[PDB]
């Protein structure tokens, strides 16, 4: 009926806003490590 104006049991708090903002970050990017199979890629 999309008309349930009842106040929500949980209210949006600021700290919730910032916590669910920072959840958007991930781990540091993982690049495929370069392989040095001879002296050329070493030098």
């Amino acid at each position: 009926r999309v008309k349930n104006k009842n106040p929500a049991p949980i209210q949006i708090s600021a700290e919730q806003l910032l916590r669910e903002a920072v959840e958007r970050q991930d781990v540091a990017f993982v690049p495929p490590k370069i392989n040095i199979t001879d002296l050329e890629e070493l030098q």
């Binding site: 490590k33 392989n35 040095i36 199979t37 001879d38 002296l39 070493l42």
Partner: peptide, 24 residues
């Protein structure tokens, strides 16, 4: 010399370790 050779061995082992650790 050994440090170069160790780097080459470790890179070779990790390159085949991609297949080795492909499924784990």
């Amino acid at each position: 010399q050994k440090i170069i050779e160790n780097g080459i061995r470790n890179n070779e082992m990790e390159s085949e370790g991609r297949k080795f650790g492909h499924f784990e």
